[PDB]
Amino acid sequence: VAFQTVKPGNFNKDFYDFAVSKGFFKEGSSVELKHFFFAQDGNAAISDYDYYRYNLPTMCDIRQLLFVVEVVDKYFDCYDGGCINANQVIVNNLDKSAGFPFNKWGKARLYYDSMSYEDQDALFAYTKRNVIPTI
RNA sequence: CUGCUCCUAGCAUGCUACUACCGCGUAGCAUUUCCCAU
């Protein structure tokens, strides 16, 4: 089992000297430090995942829920959506990660380039008729 | 991961201005040559 940790930050003295020279950080002044790089020990990833225990099953009054969703639909009446093709897509910052499988071999740019437009069109059409669980 | 902004570099396009040459087109001015047999 892995045990991930978060190492502290790095200090930058010369700015601190330049600031304290101009009369800063004196006692009683209405300004100080309340933002730091907090350190994290070992078993912290699990103890953070444990906060999901606050999710509980819950019913909702179906009648007023239907009415409220009707009104909220009435809110969003000034836009437009629809299916597009792989050519019309726009992607920003492709050089970033991609999941559990696939994070070992390049980044999203690799898979984006490696597949033609017909590959993406077929993949999109496939999901409209199946279910693909992921991690 | 989405949105916003800065900066830099490159490209490409569009548009504007300037410079040169060209030819055209027009106008003006002026000249140079001047012709013969089967």
Side-chain angles (χ1 to χ4, degrees), chain A residues 107-130:
Chain A
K107 308 183 196 302
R109 169 191 311 281
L110 162 62
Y111 308 93
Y112 265 134
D113 62 55
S114 312
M115 302 169 48
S116 76
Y117 282 20
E118 278 60 30
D119 309 330
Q120 279 112 24
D121 302 320
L123 190 47
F124 184 75
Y126 168 81
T127 72
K128 281 219 294 287
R129 275 160 45 92
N130 291 270

PDB file of all heavy atoms in Angstrom, chain A residues 107-130:
ATOM      1  N   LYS A 107       0.494  11.584 -22.281  1.00  0.00           N
ATOM      2  CA  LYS A 107      -0.611  12.391 -21.794  1.00  0.00           C
ATOM      3  C   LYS A 107      -1.715  12.422 -22.842  1.00  0.00           C
ATOM      4  O   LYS A 107      -1.636  11.764 -23.879  1.00  0.00           O
ATOM      5  CB  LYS A 107      -0.140  13.804 -21.445  1.00  0.00           C
ATOM      6  CG  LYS A 107       1.061  13.841 -20.519  1.00  0.00           C
ATOM      7  CD  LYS A 107       1.428  15.265 -20.149  1.00  0.00           C
ATOM      8  CE  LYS A 107       2.823  15.334 -19.559  1.00  0.00           C
ATOM      9  NZ  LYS A 107       2.948  14.462 -18.361  1.00  0.00           N
ATOM     10  N   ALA A 108      -2.746  13.223 -22.564  1.00  0.00           N
ATOM     11  CA  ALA A 108      -3.950  13.204 -23.388  1.00  0.00           C
ATOM     12  C   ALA A 108      -3.654  13.538 -24.843  1.00  0.00           C
ATOM     13  O   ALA A 108      -4.407  13.138 -25.738  1.00  0.00           O
ATOM     14  CB  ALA A 108      -4.985  14.176 -22.826  1.00  0.00           C
ATOM     15  N   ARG A 109      -2.566  14.265 -25.097  1.00  0.00           N
ATOM     16  CA  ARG A 109      -2.214  14.607 -26.470  1.00  0.00           C
ATOM     17  C   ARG A 109      -1.930  13.356 -27.288  1.00  0.00           C
ATOM     18  O   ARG A 109      -2.315  13.268 -28.459  1.00  0.00           O
ATOM     19  CB  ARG A 109      -1.009  15.541 -26.477  1.00  0.00           C
ATOM     20  CG  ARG A 109      -0.394  15.760 -27.840  1.00  0.00           C
ATOM     21  CD  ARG A 109       0.943  16.464 -27.717  1.00  0.00           C
ATOM     22  NE  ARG A 109       0.869  17.641 -26.862  1.00  0.00           N
ATOM     23  CZ  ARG A 109       0.386  18.816 -27.239  1.00  0.00           C
ATOM     24  NH1 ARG A 109      -0.109  19.003 -28.452  1.00  0.00           N
ATOM     25  NH2 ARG A 109       0.395  19.830 -26.379  1.00  0.00           N
ATOM     26  N   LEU A 110      -1.253  12.378 -26.682  1.00  0.00           N
ATOM     27  CA  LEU A 110      -0.913  11.147 -27.388  1.00  0.00           C
ATOM     28  C   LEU A 110      -2.163  10.430 -27.883  1.00  0.00           C
ATOM     29  O   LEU A 110      -2.273  10.091 -29.067  1.00  0.00           O
ATOM     30  CB  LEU A 110      -0.096  10.242 -26.467  1.00  0.00           C
ATOM     31  CG  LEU A 110       0.008   8.759 -26.812  1.00  0.00           C
ATOM     32  CD1 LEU A 110       0.685   8.567 -28.152  1.00  0.00           C
ATOM     33  CD2 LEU A 110       0.763   8.024 -25.720  1.00  0.00           C
ATOM     34  N   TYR A 111      -3.126  10.201 -26.990  1.00  0.00           N
ATOM     35  CA  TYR A 111      -4.342   9.511 -27.398  1.00  0.00           C
ATOM     36  C   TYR A 111      -5.177  10.368 -28.337  1.00  0.00           C
ATOM     37  O   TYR A 111      -5.839   9.836 -29.233  1.00  0.00           O
ATOM     38  CB  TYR A 111      -5.159   9.109 -26.174  1.00  0.00           C
ATOM     39  CG  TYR A 111      -4.365   8.345 -25.149  1.00  0.00           C
ATOM     40  CD1 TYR A 111      -3.744   9.000 -24.103  1.00  0.00           C
ATOM     41  CD2 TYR A 111      -4.224   6.973 -25.235  1.00  0.00           C
ATOM     42  CE1 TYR A 111      -3.013   8.310 -23.164  1.00  0.00           C
ATOM     43  CE2 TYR A 111      -3.493   6.275 -24.301  1.00  0.00           C
ATOM     44  CZ  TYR A 111      -2.889   6.950 -23.267  1.00  0.00           C
ATOM     45  OH  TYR A 111      -2.155   6.265 -22.328  1.00  0.00           O
ATOM     46  N   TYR A 112      -5.156  11.689 -28.149  1.00  0.00           N
ATOM     47  CA  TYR A 112      -5.908  12.575 -29.031  1.00  0.00           C
ATOM     48  C   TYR A 112      -5.395  12.502 -30.462  1.00  0.00           C
ATOM     49  O   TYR A 112      -6.181  12.449 -31.415  1.00  0.00           O
ATOM     50  CB  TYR A 112      -5.841  14.003 -28.505  1.00  0.00           C
ATOM     51  CG  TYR A 112      -7.011  14.381 -27.638  1.00  0.00           C
ATOM     52  CD1 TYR A 112      -6.826  15.047 -26.439  1.00  0.00           C
ATOM     53  CD2 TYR A 112      -8.305  14.057 -28.015  1.00  0.00           C
ATOM     54  CE1 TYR A 112      -7.896  15.392 -25.644  1.00  0.00           C
ATOM     55  CE2 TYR A 112      -9.382  14.400 -27.230  1.00  0.00           C
ATOM     56  CZ  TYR A 112      -9.172  15.067 -26.045  1.00  0.00           C
ATOM     57  OH  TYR A 112     -10.243  15.410 -25.255  1.00  0.00           O
ATOM     58  N   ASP A 113      -4.074  12.505 -30.637  1.00  0.00           N
ATOM     59  CA  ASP A 113      -3.526  12.465 -31.987  1.00  0.00           C
ATOM     60  C   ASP A 113      -3.617  11.069 -32.587  1.00  0.00           C
ATOM     61  O   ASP A 113      -3.918  10.923 -33.776  1.00  0.00           O
ATOM     62  CB  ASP A 113      -2.077  12.960 -31.990  1.00  0.00           C
ATOM     63  CG  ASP A 113      -1.148  12.092 -31.154  1.00  0.00           C
ATOM     64  OD1 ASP A 113      -1.086  10.866 -31.378  1.00  0.00           O
ATOM     65  OD2 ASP A 113      -0.455  12.646 -30.277  1.00  0.00           O
ATOM     66  N   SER A 114      -3.375  10.035 -31.776  1.00  0.00           N
ATOM     67  CA  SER A 114      -3.290   8.670 -32.281  1.00  0.00           C
ATOM     68  C   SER A 114      -4.584   8.189 -32.922  1.00  0.00           C
ATOM     69  O   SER A 114      -4.541   7.254 -33.728  1.00  0.00           O
ATOM     70  CB  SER A 114      -2.902   7.724 -31.147  1.00  0.00           C
ATOM     71  OG  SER A 114      -1.794   8.228 -30.427  1.00  0.00           O
ATOM     72  N   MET A 115      -5.716   8.799 -32.600  1.00  0.00           N
ATOM     73  CA  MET A 115      -7.005   8.371 -33.117  1.00  0.00           C
ATOM     74  C   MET A 115      -7.495   9.349 -34.172  1.00  0.00           C
ATOM     75  O   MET A 115      -7.450  10.566 -33.976  1.00  0.00           O
ATOM     76  CB  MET A 115      -8.036   8.260 -31.996  1.00  0.00           C
ATOM     77  CG  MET A 115      -7.639   7.310 -30.887  1.00  0.00           C
ATOM     78  SD  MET A 115      -8.730   7.446 -29.464  1.00  0.00           S
ATOM     79  CE  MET A 115     -10.324   7.385 -30.276  1.00  0.00           C
ATOM     80  N   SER A 116      -7.968   8.807 -35.288  1.00  0.00           N
ATOM     81  CA  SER A 116      -8.531   9.629 -36.345  1.00  0.00           C
ATOM     82  C   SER A 116      -9.885  10.182 -35.909  1.00  0.00           C
ATOM     83  O   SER A 116     -10.384   9.906 -34.815  1.00  0.00           O
ATOM     84  CB  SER A 116      -8.666   8.820 -37.631  1.00  0.00           C
ATOM     85  OG  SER A 116      -9.768   7.935 -37.556  1.00  0.00           O
ATOM     86  N   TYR A 117     -10.487  10.983 -36.785  1.00  0.00           N
ATOM     87  CA  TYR A 117     -11.801  11.542 -36.487  1.00  0.00           C
ATOM     88  C   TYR A 117     -12.876  10.462 -36.500  1.00  0.00           C
ATOM     89  O   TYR A 117     -13.808  10.495 -35.687  1.00  0.00           O
ATOM     90  CB  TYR A 117     -12.131  12.652 -37.482  1.00  0.00           C
ATOM     91  CG  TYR A 117     -11.439  13.963 -37.177  1.00  0.00           C
ATOM     92  CD1 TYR A 117     -10.306  14.004 -36.373  1.00  0.00           C
ATOM     93  CD2 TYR A 117     -11.917  15.157 -37.694  1.00  0.00           C
ATOM     94  CE1 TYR A 117      -9.674  15.195 -36.092  1.00  0.00           C
ATOM     95  CE2 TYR A 117     -11.288  16.350 -37.422  1.00  0.00           C
ATOM     96  CZ  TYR A 117     -10.170  16.366 -36.619  1.00  0.00           C
ATOM     97  OH  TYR A 117      -9.545  17.558 -36.343  1.00  0.00           O
ATOM     98  N   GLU A 118     -12.761   9.496 -37.413  1.00  0.00           N
ATOM     99  CA  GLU A 118     -13.733   8.411 -37.456  1.00  0.00           C
ATOM    100  C   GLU A 118     -13.662   7.551 -36.206  1.00  0.00           C
ATOM    101  O   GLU A 118     -14.683   7.010 -35.770  1.00  0.00           O
ATOM    102  CB  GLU A 118     -13.519   7.562 -38.708  1.00  0.00           C
ATOM    103  CG  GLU A 118     -14.166   8.145 -39.951  1.00  0.00           C
ATOM    104  CD  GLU A 118     -13.633   9.523 -40.297  1.00  0.00           C
ATOM    105  OE1 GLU A 118     -12.457   9.806 -39.984  1.00  0.00           O
ATOM    106  OE2 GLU A 118     -14.393  10.328 -40.874  1.00  0.00           O
ATOM    107  N   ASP A 119     -12.477   7.422 -35.609  1.00  0.00           N
ATOM    108  CA  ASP A 119     -12.368   6.701 -34.346  1.00  0.00           C
ATOM    109  C   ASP A 119     -13.204   7.373 -33.266  1.00  0.00           C
ATOM    110  O   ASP A 119     -13.962   6.711 -32.548  1.00  0.00           O
ATOM    111  CB  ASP A 119     -10.905   6.618 -33.920  1.00  0.00           C
ATOM    112  CG  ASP A 119     -10.014   6.091 -35.020  1.00  0.00           C
ATOM    113  OD1 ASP A 119     -10.503   5.293 -35.846  1.00  0.00           O
ATOM    114  OD2 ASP A 119      -8.827   6.479 -35.065  1.00  0.00           O
ATOM    115  N   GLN A 120     -13.092   8.698 -33.148  1.00  0.00           N
ATOM    116  CA  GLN A 120     -13.880   9.412 -32.151  1.00  0.00           C
ATOM    117  C   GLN A 120     -15.368   9.345 -32.466  1.00  0.00           C
ATOM    118  O   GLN A 120     -16.190   9.194 -31.557  1.00  0.00           O
ATOM    119  CB  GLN A 120     -13.420  10.863 -32.044  1.00  0.00           C
ATOM    120  CG  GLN A 120     -12.179  11.057 -31.193  1.00  0.00           C
ATOM    121  CD  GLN A 120     -10.979  11.499 -32.002  1.00  0.00           C
ATOM    122  OE1 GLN A 120     -11.121  12.080 -33.076  1.00  0.00           O
ATOM    123  NE2 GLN A 120      -9.789  11.232 -31.484  1.00  0.00           N
ATOM    124  N   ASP A 121     -15.738   9.466 -33.741  1.00  0.00           N
ATOM    125  CA  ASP A 121     -17.153   9.385 -34.088  1.00  0.00           C
ATOM    126  C   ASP A 121     -17.727   8.018 -33.741  1.00  0.00           C
ATOM    127  O   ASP A 121     -18.829   7.920 -33.187  1.00  0.00           O
ATOM    128  CB  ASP A 121     -17.358   9.694 -35.570  1.00  0.00           C
ATOM    129  CG  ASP A 121     -16.838  11.064 -35.956  1.00  0.00           C
ATOM    130  OD1 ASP A 121     -17.026  12.011 -35.164  1.00  0.00           O
ATOM    131  OD2 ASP A 121     -16.246  11.197 -37.048  1.00  0.00           O
ATOM    132  N   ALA A 122     -16.990   6.951 -34.047  1.00  0.00           N
ATOM    133  CA  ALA A 122     -17.455   5.614 -33.708  1.00  0.00           C
ATOM    134  C   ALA A 122     -17.532   5.423 -32.201  1.00  0.00           C
ATOM    135  O   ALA A 122     -18.478   4.809 -31.696  1.00  0.00           O
ATOM    136  CB  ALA A 122     -16.542   4.564 -34.338  1.00  0.00           C
ATOM    137  N   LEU A 123     -16.545   5.935 -31.464  1.00  0.00           N
ATOM    138  CA  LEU A 123     -16.578   5.799 -30.013  1.00  0.00           C
ATOM    139  C   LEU A 123     -17.774   6.531 -29.423  1.00  0.00           C
ATOM    140  O   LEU A 123     -18.436   6.018 -28.516  1.00  0.00           O
ATOM    141  CB  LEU A 123     -15.279   6.312 -29.399  1.00  0.00           C
ATOM    142  CG  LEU A 123     -15.121   5.985 -27.917  1.00  0.00           C
ATOM    143  CD1 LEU A 123     -15.452   4.533 -27.668  1.00  0.00           C
ATOM    144  CD2 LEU A 123     -13.717   6.287 -27.443  1.00  0.00           C
ATOM    145  N   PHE A 124     -18.068   7.730 -29.924  1.00  0.00           N
ATOM    146  CA  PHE A 124     -19.224   8.471 -29.433  1.00  0.00           C
ATOM    147  C   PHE A 124     -20.524   7.754 -29.770  1.00  0.00           C
ATOM    148  O   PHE A 124     -21.425   7.656 -28.930  1.00  0.00           O
ATOM    149  CB  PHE A 124     -19.229   9.882 -30.008  1.00  0.00           C
ATOM    150  CG  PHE A 124     -20.339  10.735 -29.487  1.00  0.00           C
ATOM    151  CD1 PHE A 124     -20.283  11.259 -28.211  1.00  0.00           C
ATOM    152  CD2 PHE A 124     -21.442  11.011 -30.273  1.00  0.00           C
ATOM    153  CE1 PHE A 124     -21.308  12.044 -27.730  1.00  0.00           C
ATOM    154  CE2 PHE A 124     -22.468  11.796 -29.799  1.00  0.00           C
ATOM    155  CZ  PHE A 124     -22.403  12.314 -28.525  1.00  0.00           C
ATOM    156  N   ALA A 125     -20.645   7.247 -30.998  1.00  0.00           N
ATOM    157  CA  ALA A 125     -21.849   6.510 -31.364  1.00  0.00           C
ATOM    158  C   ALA A 125     -22.011   5.242 -30.540  1.00  0.00           C
ATOM    159  O   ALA A 125     -23.142   4.842 -30.250  1.00  0.00           O
ATOM    160  CB  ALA A 125     -21.829   6.168 -32.852  1.00  0.00           C
ATOM    161  N   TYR A 126     -20.903   4.609 -30.156  1.00  0.00           N
ATOM    162  CA  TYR A 126     -20.974   3.388 -29.366  1.00  0.00           C
ATOM    163  C   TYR A 126     -21.540   3.657 -27.979  1.00  0.00           C
ATOM    164  O   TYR A 126     -22.381   2.897 -27.486  1.00  0.00           O
ATOM    165  CB  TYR A 126     -19.588   2.755 -29.277  1.00  0.00           C
ATOM    166  CG  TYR A 126     -19.470   1.652 -28.256  1.00  0.00           C
ATOM    167  CD1 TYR A 126     -19.893   0.366 -28.544  1.00  0.00           C
ATOM    168  CD2 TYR A 126     -18.916   1.894 -27.011  1.00  0.00           C
ATOM    169  CE1 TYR A 126     -19.779  -0.646 -27.612  1.00  0.00           C
ATOM    170  CE2 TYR A 126     -18.799   0.892 -26.075  1.00  0.00           C
ATOM    171  CZ  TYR A 126     -19.231  -0.377 -26.380  1.00  0.00           C
ATOM    172  OH  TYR A 126     -19.115  -1.381 -25.447  1.00  0.00           O
ATOM    173  N   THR A 127     -21.097   4.736 -27.332  1.00  0.00           N
ATOM    174  CA  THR A 127     -21.567   5.020 -25.981  1.00  0.00           C
ATOM    175  C   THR A 127     -23.047   5.358 -25.945  1.00  0.00           C
ATOM    176  O   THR A 127     -23.662   5.269 -24.880  1.00  0.00           O
ATOM    177  CB  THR A 127     -20.782   6.169 -25.360  1.00  0.00           C
ATOM    178  OG1 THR A 127     -21.166   7.397 -25.986  1.00  0.00           O
ATOM    179  CG2 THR A 127     -19.301   5.958 -25.542  1.00  0.00           C
ATOM    180  N   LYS A 128     -23.629   5.739 -27.068  1.00  0.00           N
ATOM    181  CA  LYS A 128     -25.060   6.003 -27.074  1.00  0.00           C
ATOM    182  C   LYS A 128     -25.877   4.747 -27.101  1.00  0.00           C
ATOM    183  O   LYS A 128     -27.105   4.822 -27.198  1.00  0.00           O
ATOM    184  CB  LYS A 128     -25.422   6.891 -28.262  1.00  0.00           C
ATOM    185  CG  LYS A 128     -25.112   8.356 -28.033  1.00  0.00           C
ATOM    186  CD  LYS A 128     -26.186   9.250 -28.622  1.00  0.00           C
ATOM    187  CE  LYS A 128     -26.227   9.155 -30.136  1.00  0.00           C
ATOM    188  NZ  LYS A 128     -25.066   9.840 -30.762  1.00  0.00           N
ATOM    189  N   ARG A 129     -25.216   3.586 -27.026  1.00  0.00           N
ATOM    190  CA  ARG A 129     -25.939   2.319 -27.015  1.00  0.00           C
ATOM    191  C   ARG A 129     -25.355   1.316 -26.025  1.00  0.00           C
ATOM    192  O   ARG A 129     -25.710   0.135 -26.091  1.00  0.00           O
ATOM    193  CB  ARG A 129     -25.940   1.698 -28.412  1.00  0.00           C
ATOM    194  CG  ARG A 129     -27.046   2.211 -29.307  1.00  0.00           C
ATOM    195  CD  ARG A 129     -26.719   1.969 -30.766  1.00  0.00           C
ATOM    196  NE  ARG A 129     -26.199   0.627 -30.991  1.00  0.00           N
ATOM    197  CZ  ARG A 129     -26.946  -0.418 -31.316  1.00  0.00           C
ATOM    198  NH1 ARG A 129     -28.254  -0.310 -31.478  1.00  0.00           N
ATOM    199  NH2 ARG A 129     -26.367  -1.603 -31.484  1.00  0.00           N
ATOM    200  N   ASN A 130     -24.474   1.734 -25.124  1.00  0.00           N
ATOM    201  CA  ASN A 130     -23.838   0.813 -24.190  1.00  0.00           C
ATOM    202  C   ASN A 130     -23.524   1.564 -22.903  1.00  0.00           C
ATOM    203  O   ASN A 130     -23.922   2.721 -22.731  1.00  0.00           O
ATOM    204  CB  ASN A 130     -22.584   0.190 -24.821  1.00  0.00           C
ATOM    205  CG  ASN A 130     -22.913  -0.755 -25.945  1.00  0.00           C
ATOM    206  OD1 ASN A 130     -23.101  -1.949 -25.728  1.00  0.00           O
ATOM    207  ND2 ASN A 130     -22.997  -0.226 -27.157  1.00  0.00           N
TER     208      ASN A 130
END
